[PDB]
């Protein structure tokens, strides 16, 4: 689709067998999801941005279907305010900005 930005660019995703909503976030290098159950090995990690930092769990090679487009990659799991799809996955579904 083409998505205007008068509202937050929220899409449905499927990850770890679960349905969620997430924000297409061009300002995020990485993909960060609220606490959730994901199978497998992970690594403790600290990420920052405005306001300070959070501890995350880093899970690699995770399959995620974003608005119907499949991608595989790294997903951080932790106390984010909202689920964020960052550029590491936006590139995989061919998302661009246009103006």
Ligand X SMILES: CC(C)=CCN([C@H]1CNC[C@@H]1N(CC=C(C)C)S(=O)(=O)c1ccc(C(N)=O)cc1)S(=O)(=O)c1ccc(C(N)=O)cc1
Catalytic residue list:
25
Which tokens belong to 60? 């690699």
Give the interface segment with ligand X, choosing from 20-28, 37-45, 66-74, 91-99 (CB under 6 A): 20-28
**Residue 2: CB atoms within 10 Å:** 4
Please state, in angstroms and rounded to a whole number, the distance separating the CA atoms of residues 50 and 98: 26
Q: Does 73 bind a second copy (CB under 8 A)?
A: no
Q: Which of 16, 67, 73, 74 binds a second copy (CB under 8 A)?
A: 67
Structure tokens at 86: 């960052």
6 binds a second copy (CB under 8 A): yes
Number of C-beta neighbours around residue 58 at 10 A: 17
Structure tokens, 49:
């941005």
Decide whether 36 or 47 has the Cβ nearer to ligand X: 47
Note the residues at the interface with ligand X (CB under 6 A): 8, 23, 25, 27-30, 32, 47, 49-50, 81-82, 86
């Amino acid at each position: 689709p083409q998505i205007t930005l008068w509202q937050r660019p929220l899409v449905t995703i499927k990850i770890g067998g679960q349905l969620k909503e997430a924000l297409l976030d061009t300002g995020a290098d990485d993909t960060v999801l609220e606490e959730m159950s994901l199978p497998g090995r992970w690594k403790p990690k600290m990420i920052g941005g405005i306001g300070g930092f959070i501890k995350v769990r880093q899970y690699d090679q995770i399959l995620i279907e974003i608005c119907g487009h499949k991608a595989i990659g790294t997903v951080l799991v932790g106390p984010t305010p909202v689920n964020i799809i960052g550029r590491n996955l936006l590139t995989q579904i061919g998302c661009t900005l246009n103006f």
